[PDB]
Structure 1
Amino acid sequence: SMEQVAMELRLTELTRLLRSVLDQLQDKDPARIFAQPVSLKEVPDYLDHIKHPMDFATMRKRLEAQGYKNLHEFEEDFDLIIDNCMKYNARDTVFYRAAVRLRDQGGVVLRQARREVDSIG
């Protein structure tokens, strides 16, 4: 149908907007602490602590399969990256501090993406 195709053009455009959001959020992590999954070879107990691991490469794979239906789902994944880090790592670590900075900095980007999604439909 024509409706299904119109829908698919909107998801494609949302995917387009979310890709730009993702790049902007990832720039706020120049150390690349959040680029890749936590290694289970290097942190063998990780899944005993963290039930839903997340990272920017995993988000990108979902993104390119158009697996984000709306901004809320994309934000959920971003929040996992931060929230998992802040639990597993203590307050006085470079990792925890990097998460705080990414949250703070990403907030600005997410604030305007929400306006852009509502605005453009």
Structure 2
Amino acid sequence: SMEQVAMELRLTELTRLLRSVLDQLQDKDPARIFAQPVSLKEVPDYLDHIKHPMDFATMRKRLEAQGYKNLHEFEEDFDLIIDNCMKYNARDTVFYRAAVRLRDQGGVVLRQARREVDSIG
């Protein structure tokens, strides 16, 4: 149908905008602490602690399959990255601190993303 096509064009355009958001958030992680999944070879107990692991490469895979239907779904995954780190790692660690800085800096990016998503529809 033509409606299905229009819906698909909307999803494509959301994916475009979320790709730019993802790039901007990942720039706020210049140490690449959140770039890849926590290695279960190197942290073998991780899944005992963290039930839903997340990282930027995993988000990018979902994004490129057009697997985010709306900004809320995308934000859920970004918040997992931050929140998982702040639980597994203590306050005095470079990992926790990186997560705080990512959260604080990403907030600005996400605030305008939400306005754009609503504005363009």
Do the two structures share a fold, i.e. TM-score over 0.5? Answer: yes
How far apart are residue 96 of structure 1 and its match?
0.1
For residues 8 and 86 of structure 1, what CA distance do their matches in structure 2 show?
A: 36
> What's the CA shift string for 1:5-58, capped at 9, x where partnerless?
000000000000000000000000000000000000000000000000000000
Partner deviation per Cα, 1:82-104 (whole Å, 9 max, x = no partner): 00000000000000000000000
Residue ranges of structure 1 left out of the alignment (5+ in a row): none
| % identical equivalent positions | 100
- Separation in 1, partners of 2:50, 2:75: 18
Match in the other structure for 2:109: 109
2: distance between equivalents of 1:14 and 1:93? Answer: 35
Moved over 4 A (4+): none
Render the CA deviation track for 1:53-81: whole Å, top value 9, x for unaligned: 00000000000000000000000000000
Partners of 1:12 and 1:118 in 2: CA distance? 16
- 1 CA distance for matches of 2:62 and 2:93? 29
Write the distance in 2 (CA, Å) between the matches of 1:73 and 1:6. Answer: 21
User: Counterparts of 1:118 and 1:12 in 2: how far apart (Å)?
Assistant: 16
* Residue 120, structure 1, aligned to residue 115, structure 2: no
C-alpha root-mean-square deviation of aligned residues, in Å? 0.1
CA distance in 2, matches of 1:12, 1:113: 16
Residues in 1 aligned to 2:5 and 2:100: alpha-carbon distance in whole angstroms: 40
